[PDB]
Amino acid sequence: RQNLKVLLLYCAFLLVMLLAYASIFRYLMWHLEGRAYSFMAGIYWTITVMTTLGFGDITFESDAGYLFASIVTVSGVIFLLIILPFGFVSMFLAPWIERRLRYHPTIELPDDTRGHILIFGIDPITRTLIRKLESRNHLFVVVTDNYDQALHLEEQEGFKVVYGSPTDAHVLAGLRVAAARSIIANLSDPDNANLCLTVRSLCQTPIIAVVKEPVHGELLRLAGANQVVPLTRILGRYLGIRATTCGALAHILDSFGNLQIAELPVHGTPFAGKTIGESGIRQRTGLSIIGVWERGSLTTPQRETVLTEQSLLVLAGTKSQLAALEYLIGEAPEDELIFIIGHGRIGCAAAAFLDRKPVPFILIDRQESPVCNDHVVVYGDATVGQTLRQAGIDRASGIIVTTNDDSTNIFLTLACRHLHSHIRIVARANGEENVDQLYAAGADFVVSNASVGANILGNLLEHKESAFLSEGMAVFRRPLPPAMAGKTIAETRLRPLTGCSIVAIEAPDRADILISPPPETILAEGARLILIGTSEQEKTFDQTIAAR
Amino acid sequence: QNLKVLLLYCAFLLVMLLAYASIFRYLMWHLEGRAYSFMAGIYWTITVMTTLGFGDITFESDAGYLFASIVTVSGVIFLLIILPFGFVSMFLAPWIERRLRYHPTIELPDDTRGHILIFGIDPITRTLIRKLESRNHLFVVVTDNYDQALHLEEQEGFKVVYGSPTDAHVLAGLRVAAARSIIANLSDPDNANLCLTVRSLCQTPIIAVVKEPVHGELLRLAGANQVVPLTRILGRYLGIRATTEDELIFIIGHGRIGCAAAAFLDRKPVPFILIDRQESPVCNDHVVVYGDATVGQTLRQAGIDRASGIIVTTNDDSTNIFLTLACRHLHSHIRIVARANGEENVDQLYAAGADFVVSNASVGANILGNLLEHK
Amino acid sequence: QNLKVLLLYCAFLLVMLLAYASIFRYLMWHLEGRAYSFMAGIYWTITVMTTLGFGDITFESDAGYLFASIVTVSGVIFLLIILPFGFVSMFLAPWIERRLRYHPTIELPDDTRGHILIFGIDPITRTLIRKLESRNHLFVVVTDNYDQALHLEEQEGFKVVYGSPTDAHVLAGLRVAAARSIIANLSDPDNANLCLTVRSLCQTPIIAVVKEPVHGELLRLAGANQVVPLTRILGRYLGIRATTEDELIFIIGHGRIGCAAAAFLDRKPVPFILIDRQESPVCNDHVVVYGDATVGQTLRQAGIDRASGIIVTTNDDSTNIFLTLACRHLHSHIRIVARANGEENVDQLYAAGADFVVSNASVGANILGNLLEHK
Amino acid sequence: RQNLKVLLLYCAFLLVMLLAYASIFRYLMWHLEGRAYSFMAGIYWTITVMTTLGFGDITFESDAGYLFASIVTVSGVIFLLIILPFGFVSMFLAPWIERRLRYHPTIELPDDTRGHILIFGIDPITRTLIRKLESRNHLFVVVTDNYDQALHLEEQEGFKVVYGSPTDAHVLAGLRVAAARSIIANLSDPDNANLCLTVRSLCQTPIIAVVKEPVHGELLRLAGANQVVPLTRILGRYLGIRATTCGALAHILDSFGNLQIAELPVHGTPFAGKTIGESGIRQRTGLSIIGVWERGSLTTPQRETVLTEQSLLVLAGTKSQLAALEYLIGEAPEDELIFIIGHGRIGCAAAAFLDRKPVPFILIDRQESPVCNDHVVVYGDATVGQTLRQAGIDRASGIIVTTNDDSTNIFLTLACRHLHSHIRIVARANGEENVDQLYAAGADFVVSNASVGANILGNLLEHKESAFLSEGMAVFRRPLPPAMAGKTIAETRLRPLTGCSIVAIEAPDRADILISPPPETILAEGARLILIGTSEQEKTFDQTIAAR
Ligand SMILES: [Ca+2]
Ligand SMILES: [Ca+2]
Ligand SMILES: [Ca+2]
Ligand SMILES: [Ca+2]
Ligand SMILES: [K+]
Ligand SMILES: [K+]
Ligand SMILES: [K+]
Ligand SMILES: [K+]
Ligand SMILES: [K+]
Ligand SMILES: [K+]
Ligand SMILES: [Zn+2]
Ligand SMILES: [Zn+2]
Ligand SMILES: [Zn+2]
Ligand SMILES: [Zn+2]
């Protein structure tokens, strides 16, 4: 842009210089020496002089003609010999060298820039959220106050990088935060607080803050943030659920008090190896298989679907419906004891989780946690010798390996699995490049940080048409009224009446479900509906069915 | 400088021109018997050196060949090598050489007078500069830190010099004698060194910002014309804002300021609690409640409930904000006074819930600024 | 690459030449009725583009003027801009661009086979390289450390790649499948990661240098074809050299080696004293006498007098030298075995008084080297 | 050198190309078209073609002539249009940019380099030894293994800088250590040991090692070093001598057992304010004023010389002669108590000194000395408040301020002198740029590290014709034999007879001395000689006087 324009702007000047001279010449030849020259001769002459070719076939004779020739000559040397080779070189050669040779840190965004997604605080999660959602070519812009880090992210991108204080309002003004589509506040909690209060001072643009300590959750909504994600606590959960010898029930959401969305690791459970229709999970409980999570993907349930031990079943149903699956697994193993190696915010979160549903564990680390005063820790280097065995890794029913270094995690998983082939080992993979290797070391399940993080933010980013809608709302299930047996969702006109929206229609006699049905969907008899609206829209719903 | 070297070389070139154009007209006459008009001589000489080469005006004698060969090369050496080099070197070097690698300015020009020497850059001084360059005073900051001279050179509005502020030779190059005023905002021992050294070269007025108020008379002693105990003052402004029985003021942060503020609330007896993480390396006369205020029930275990005032005094604004935000959530009616190092965060401490905010940079600049034009 | 782009552009230029020289001869004939020999066409075309401009062969019709104007510019664009650029860009860029700022090599060519991947550079491997490039094997070292890739790139004899040795995509670019052998000389957890990852891409032989000998079977388990417990071995070589009653051997230095050596002198019961400064982060089974050996009567308070042998095992050669020098001064007849990390200091440990010197780099290279060509 | 040669080598080729072409042309014109051209025409043509001037007055006509013209044309564009502008630019423009833009670290010395002085371990002392002895333009070469430090020393020099391991023998080989004049080993003691053992492996070049811990002195001579300087211990001495309220006697050398070279701070002594002849120091004791040290300079004593309080008197005489000056000062003040603020190697050395001649002191510091277990230290920050007064700085007779930071030293000296105007304050100046300011703060005397260091090394460097001669020798004084009353030193021919050398001849009845007398010096009656030879040369001396 700014360099190419300067180029052919200067070419327009040169062509003007040409056409001018070629005519001044034809004038002089006529008015000085009495020679009528064709126009092309004027061009041909002028070119020949400036370019310093100088054929000498067309020359002047009067001193006056000498002067104008001398002039045109120099004008060739100044503008075709100096500037034009300079400009061709300066606009082409400078970018390759000046910008690799020394950083020219981008400090501001263009005036017109809109629709971008501001990333504040780069790390494995966000870096993975970027590589994943640039598959829709969103304009991802990351920001850093760290000069040497802006260097790295500028040479390898994918995403434009800005260098500056994320709290300085003037900086945020140059980032056109008002015209932004969404802002990801992935800094420290006090910086996240500063960040939000500052953005709320310039605009109202949606801010998804990733909070470290879950207690600071309400404090960041308070700082302005539209949605808060306690990632460290969540990953701890996913670890504690994966470690419980027999796959246990995990509660995801309490939609008012009507419906519970939950999940279940199929491992060590009578549904493992068995299929969906074979297990007949919906039939015996009345539950709703809203989706199955196997190989890092969200898929719709099928009857012919075999549940691997590695699988995770999402659920939806009443409190007495979930209860029916805590008995269809369904007995706890005697002498449970889970080693949690690593007392980060995650290992601590996981230990807080295994506390919530009482399973005794041992927290092993090297130094004491700067954050936690409520967890007793066994102190000692796990890498060095008999440390795990002195704690008694022998009577353990599960090892959760939670170091912030993947290479170490691998080496423990490798060390444990060698030492005990049959025990449940759950590891944690910061960088998702090491996921495959924790499995290959012997991990029964691997929780990739980057992957789980990106998936949450990603979903919260493209659901951001109704994510703050979904926030502060209740989701419910309604047995489809027989009056609408055979009628379209569109023909029924449910949303203009009630305000609720259909997200899923399952079969009357099947574990199969149709999720996010199109407006042209013809309803069926007995088909069980599951919708999302306000608490009060679930309410006025029952009329607009009775009304019409 | 670089421009002078350019058109000095253009004067030489025009001399070369007028000379050659006349040597030519001489030769044509004295070698081959051709009288050429002066303009023809210029026109020829230009045509040769510029290597255009029309060939309408040529010599014939071997002698004429020689002078033509000479004028030809002189064109290639001075219009083909130097003049494109010089146009490129004076224009292209500054954009690249100076962004690409630092050429640290080590000295001030001979004639430089009326400048205001800044020694020890920080939020205060940086704010004193943006504020008093609205009268376009020549602000010159100095640092012994190479990597810091880099930052301040690319972003300016003030020229930056790299060198030891205590080395007398350095101060001599800074023309301290002809200076209008000197701001000594370093450590107390450095400030002392700085003054004793300037008093050795001149008598130029020196406004020293003293950290520990006891060292105040020691710096006037080092030469300083006026001494400003900024940390003590900001503590005062905090203690005054927090009172305005069962009075009880939490002071979160035991810096020199929170300690100054606690020393202030002592002077007019109001009971307070000093909360911090580590013990103050400077104070042995204030009892401190030790514990991280960010982590959980720390403030409540001290009893933030029967408190009539919280003074939030961390040296990090983002943390101050997050406390003010945390306190005001926890207690809507109590007087919360916060402190804003960088004045970019002032608005946000208010927005968090601060009943009053004391901006360091702002209060500092205002004092120095006033002391500078009242000088 | 860069050379190809050059004479590819020369082929285009010669095409431009032969084309123009014929278009010209055509025009002269079809425009003005002048038959020109082919060489005249070349000679003209050269003369125009090169901007020489003799003016002996010129057109007269406006049409001829146009084609001449065209050929003229085509000379200025392709002989005046690109050809001097390209000669400069392919020649001048490598000397400057690559010394001036690093362009870190991130990947290996498609066809690269028969190479020996080095993972984890240090005195041993660096010595294994200088020794086995006497058969001109393609040694490629890898590092995730940017500033270390710089050093190893300017001083080589081995190509350097910058990247995570555990990232599978990185290993894919290194053509690990077509590799001849891989040397895993990282930490034990990294070595484990490294192997499990290579075993995921290929089955290429991996010689892992294991630090703690207990992790030996764990690395064969990670895939490694052969495991070398170098630290344990060097300890052995030290313990053997120090015996060869009242036998009593001082082992100065409680590294993995001095600890290995002490474990060795345990296996065939000879009483010793382990002297160090801090406690070993790895060993809880060796009692150590704590105290700085450099500072005064430390060795004599332990009783270096009734000792039958000193094993000097510091990870600094200059210190080892200074101890060996200090001991041999203090006791001429006692058996002193020292350890030489860098083999540049071997001669000096002898010269200080070492009865035998165990060079780390040398013993390491010899083992790996043998394991590499016996492979 | 290497770049200029490549330039005019290429100019020789160009002129060859010229003279060749100009003759090929004249040949062709004759053998192709039948035109005899003068030689100058050939040059003139050839120039005109290659330079792309192209007058077109002299052209060919045959196709053959076209070819050779086309050839000469291109040869102009390749060698006058590409290389010659490149080479003019590359040899001129590269040094200014390539070398400022990125370091090209000098890794080796030229083959022929001899007579240089290798500096190993740059610091205030050596940097001052360099600025001082480049006033004789010696080739000072400093060496460092620190890349970022080689950068600094290369841009500011004065002295060429080499980058490499000073212990690596190959490195030392490139430094041509064999052809070296002298080597200064100013590294750590183990590095100094390594350095010497390595140099002794390549050559025998003289090595002056600056030893930190004085106990390691004999260990470095053992490593090869020809002379060892325990600088830290010496500076401690100079501090302890300066602090003793009344100027005390300090013993410099025990030449066998015959003669003692000593010194005396004149401060607080009855010679202060008084002159040399007025005090009549030589007269009452028999001592020899070998030189006076006032303002950082070594000067010959004069009778009309006033001894300031700041002065230091060097001495030479027997054990009973020095004794006579420990009573002419001469009484110790009651209640002596010296604060030594700073427990470095120097403050510790100074405290070890004030121990040797029992004066009670207080060692104050912040942390405990990693090196000393024999000095009890009062721990506490001296900058912070009542720390000095709680130790009782009130009953102190002297403060020695010995921090490794000058700005702090200044601030203490400034703080003490404020607190106590009359007490003896001795400070220490690392960098000699701060010396003036310690005085201006109130220091009664300032010991500049850099200055005292350079002066020792400097002297040891230019005395290196007889420094190792002076080492292991004894210096003596002899009452000039009356037989040589009126005879020259040269006429006497003392050195070929005895082997001793005259360094000083003083007057029979004067405190004045003539030092390093020229060979043409006519002796006098009673004039007292002081010479330097071997222990055994002082012996055989008494014959060669009795012989003739
Ligand atoms: Ca991996
Ligand atoms: Ca802000
Ligand atoms: Ca060596
Ligand atoms: Ca100074
Ligand atoms: K012509
Ligand atoms: K003609
Ligand atoms: K021409
Ligand atoms: K021409
Ligand atoms: K030309
Ligand atoms: K040109
Ligand atoms: Zn915890
Ligand atoms: Zn305090
Ligand atoms: Zn051990
Ligand atoms: Zn001591």
Residue numbers in the entry:
A (entry chain B), D (entry chain B): 17 to 564
B (entry chain A), C (entry chain A): 18 to 261, 350 to 480
Per the authors:
We demonstrate that GsuK is a nucleotide-activated and Ca2+-deactivated K+ channel and reveal the structural mechanism of multi-ligand gating of this double-RCK K+ channel and a distinct pore opening mechanics. Ca2+ stabilizes the closed gating ring by binding at the inter-subunit assembly interfaces and deactivates the GsuK channel. While both NAD+ and ADP anchor their adenine rings at the same site on RCK2 by using the conserved nucleotide binding motif, they utilize different functional groups and activate the channel at different sites.
Second, rather than forming a bundle crossing right below the central cavity as seen in the closed KcsA structure, the four inner helices of GsuK are more parallel to the central pore axis and generate an elongated, water-filled vestibule that spans twice the length of the KcsA cavity. Despite the similar gating ring structures, the ion conduction pores of the wild-type and L97D mutant channels exhibit obvious differences along the inner helix. As shown in the pore superimposition, the inner helices of the wild-type and mutant channels diverge at the glycine gating hinge (Gly92), but converge at the C-terminal end of the inner helix where the bundle crossing forms. Although the intracellular gates of both the wild-type and L97D mutant channels are closed in the structures, the structural difference between their ion conduction pores suggests a distinct pore opening mechanism for GsuK. GsuK has its intracellular gate at the end of the inner helix, distal from the canonical bundle crossing seen in KcsA, allowing for direct coupling to the gating ring through the extended linker.
